[PDB]
Amino acid sequence: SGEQVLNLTESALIPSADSTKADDQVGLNVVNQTNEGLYALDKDGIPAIAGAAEEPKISDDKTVYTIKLREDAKWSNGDPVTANDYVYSWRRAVDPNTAATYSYLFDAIKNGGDIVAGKKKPEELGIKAVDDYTLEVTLSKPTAYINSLFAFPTFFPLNEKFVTEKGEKYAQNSDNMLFNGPFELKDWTGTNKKWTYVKNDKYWDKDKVKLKQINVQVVQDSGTGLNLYNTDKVDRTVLSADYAAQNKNNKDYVTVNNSSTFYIKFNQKRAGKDTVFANKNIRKAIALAIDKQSYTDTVLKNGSKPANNLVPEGFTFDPGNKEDYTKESGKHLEYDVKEAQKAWKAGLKELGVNEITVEFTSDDTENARKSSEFIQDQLQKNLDGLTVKLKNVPFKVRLQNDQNQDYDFSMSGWGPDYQDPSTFLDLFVTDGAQNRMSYSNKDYDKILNDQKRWDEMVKAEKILLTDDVAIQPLYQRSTAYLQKDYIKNLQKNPFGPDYTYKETYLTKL
């Protein structure tokens, strides 16, 4: 009931809206509204056929998938969505020229690994257009979460003609994108603080889309957000720190468990030279010197809780006995000032220095600045002779500097792309596109490269955390909001792109 226009906020400028290249939660959420793959997560968090017209035929050994495509699916320029669009985009994803950070997900597809490494041509990838509306996908091995990959933006189709025509400007703004999802993107210049979703009249399932328009603006402090919410300019707003705590008893307060882990990254090599974090004792000193409980109680105050695992609690469970991965792994790198100070003294002796300066990178929101000041406080008071310089940059700049290894240490986070520990653990394999720390442990790589698979993944976390201190988990993220009661059917996805607005609607007045 009433006008079906939804007004939302986002905490950062869009880093990428290229469905192949995007690897961040902001951009992946955008392309999830505007484009669509073979599957998409349903209301219960299960991948369901979307671009696929029916349930695939699957071989006995579960490696060959024969998939019929919707014959009524169209691009926003009227071109039909065909098998060729999937072949093109999956080859694009593995093509070394593209340097797509998620190219490693295509290890699941026959020859994907070899193509990323330049050992085979992209045309050898295990996807074939049998005809214009039929795919044959050949996996490298049985992959239980394959349908979750099919629901992930890197596996969405692309219109080769359009992508080619736009060249290096492809997806740099909303005029340089094509849409096959519930919404079209409008009003995005590439670098501005507003953008718009408009119901796509050429979407095959448009009769289920109820919102005519979704307006998004960048807001980076809860006070501004709250004022906009109270003056009815936005319908949902993020609350952090005291703003969460002051509104936690409000009728419209809601908490979202993101099953995401925020962690400290320790870059071991910058501009070709070892940093101080090449020393394990120094990594351990920083890691163990942060009161994680106080952090969440002081900085977040939003349902977030301390993390002593990379893999979040409550997310993934043993196929044998159904017990949580985190219970089997146990805690790692628990807050301990004395053990931190022991590591600090030993590290400083090994390096032959009395003092160290390092720069801590985080984002440029009000709460990220509070976070950084808290961590600076913790490390400086606990570790004599340590100076921590603060860098607080736009999310996209942090990510660029991460890819370039142009940082010392940083606050980073990962949300799962499918429901298995590997979504987290695979990040820190040697030379991985999401490693970017020059962290390399061959035993860790060997583990990650069925009950046996699970048991080994449990063991891997001990190597990463307790043994090597590659990173330091800080918290398991929840997010607090005020949310107007008239928003109905707001689908929060348990993994992959964060939201699906497709069937969201409003019961205003």
Binding site: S11, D24, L28, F262, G413, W414, G415, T479
Partner: peptide, 6 residues
């Protein structure tokens, strides 16, 4: 997916 600190 890489997470932003709100």
């Amino acid at each position: 997916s890489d997470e932003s600190k709100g």
